[PDB]
């Protein structure tokens, strides 16, 4: 039957970007015309395909990755980008073929007392490969001498919180992001639109 897009888009709780969620999708009909929820700042850009007549193609599988980032960082979720999120949290392949859909969620993920639940990775020695997920919380060793799980000089916790308050600028307001990746191999196409 229908693909569980509302399961991942209209979902109540989203993930921290370093622990970005992945929802494999197969064996269903995909209606893309409903992904426009008319949220405040709706972003919908695709690579390798046109958003229109998208219910016209079929794919072997479709991956729905979801997370929350800061409003400025939505630019980093794109092929061939460097930065905070692209290097160490979520890396798109240079030949990415799919769509990126993001929207402002200041009304959901911001509390006046400040929301520190969402996290992102600050410290990492090397860039992420595309679609890598690093969930390690080992203390970052920035010095010559080992940390042994203790924060301090030359020894930092690798993650930092986002600090979402409603009155912050739009750049720093929370944004909910779903990246749909279209996989097509020499196998039956299990994800289709109408026709």
């Amino acid at each position: 039957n229908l693909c569980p897009f509302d399961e991942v888009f209209n979902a109540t709780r989203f993930a921290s970007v370093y622990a970005w969620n992945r929802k494999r999708i197969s064996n269903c009909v995909a209606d893309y015309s409903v992904l426009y929820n008319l949220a405040p700042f709706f972003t919908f850009k695709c690579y390798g395909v046109s958003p229109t007549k998208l219910n016209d193609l079929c794919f072997t599988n479709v991956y729905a990755d979801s997370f929350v980032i800061r409003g400025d960082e939505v630019r980093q979720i794109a092929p061939g980008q460097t930065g905070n999120i692209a290097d160490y949290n979520y890396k798109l392949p240079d030949d990415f073929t799919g769509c990126v859909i993001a929207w402002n969620s200041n009304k959901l993920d911001s509390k006046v007392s400040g929301n520190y639940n969402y996290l992102y990775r600050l410290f990492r020695k090397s860039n992420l490969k595309p679609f890598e997920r690093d969930i390690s919380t080992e203390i970052y060793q920035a010095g010559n001498k080992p940390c042994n799980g203790v924060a301090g000089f030359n020894c930092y916790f690798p993650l930092r919180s986002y600090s979402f308050r409603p009155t912050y600028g739009v750049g720093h307001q929370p944004y909910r992001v779903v990246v749909l990746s279209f996989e097509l191999l020499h196998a039956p196409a299990t994800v289709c639109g109408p026709k």
Partner: antibody, heavy 116, light 111 residues
């Protein structure tokens, strides 16, 4: 391992010249840290010039775009700022700094004067 | 446009033993973790006083203290010492450059 940054390479050049500042660190490892170049013009404030991430990515101020290149030699544990097409407004004391919880390790500074 | 930090006052004269507050105002609301306060004396490099707008850097005397959130953050010396007469810059270290500084506040002697 007394932590410090020691800087060198600054000096006097006419406009359009090149100059490669270096910043040798002890106490931490430059390839593993966020390293920043910050300049301060005489009688003025502090201005961020450039930064290199541990993962490799480099960012520059709009003023130095296309003219300055930040880099590092891991074996010598040294940061570098190469300055090309130099201009009089780049005249400043240049510091290197390590940034984890604010910039906590600051170099001495080396002086760049660019004048015809 | 950009994220601009404005320090009030530019110049401020106090006496030894006085309580002093310097205010740093941001153009738009920012996470409090971004702020750092720096102290600089003539001819010497800046020294990190406070980061996260409230967390005290190690080795800094307890009289220094920072506070704030949103667009207004302050740094305070409880009892101003003779060695404290210097210039203080406020800073924001955010997730994507540029890192912006305030214009600095010069702390001079009251006579």
């Amino acid at each position: 391992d007394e932590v410090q940054l020691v800087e060198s390479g600054g000096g006097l050049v006419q406009p359009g010249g090149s100059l490669r500042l270096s910043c040798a660190a002890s106490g931490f490892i430059v390839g593993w840290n966020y390293m920043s170049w910050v300049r301060q013009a005489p009688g003025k404030g502090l201005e961020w010039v450039s930064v290199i991430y541990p993962g490799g990515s480099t960012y520059y101020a709009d003023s130095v775009k296309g003219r300055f290149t930040i880099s590092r030699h891991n074996s010598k544990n040294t940061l570098y700022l190469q300055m090309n097409s130099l201009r009089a407004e780049d005249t400043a004391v240049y510091y290197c700094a390590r940034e984890a919880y604010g910039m906590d390790v600051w170099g001495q500074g080396t002086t760049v004067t660019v004048s015809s | 446009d950009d994220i601009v930090m404005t320090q009030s006052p530019s110049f401020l004269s106090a006496s030894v033993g006085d309580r002093v507050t310097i205010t740093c105002r941001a153009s738009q609301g920012i996470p409090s973790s971004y702020l750092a306060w720096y102290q600089q004396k003539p001819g010497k490099a800046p020294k990190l006083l406070i980061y996260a707008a409230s967390t005290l850097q190690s080795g800094v005397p307890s009289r220094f203290s920072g506070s704030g959130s949103g667009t207004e953050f302050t740094l305070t010396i409880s009892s101003l010492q003779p060695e404290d007469f210097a210039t203080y810059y406020c800073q924001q270290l955010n997730s994507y450059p540029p890192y912006t500084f305030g214009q600095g506040t010069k702390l001079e002697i009251k006579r």
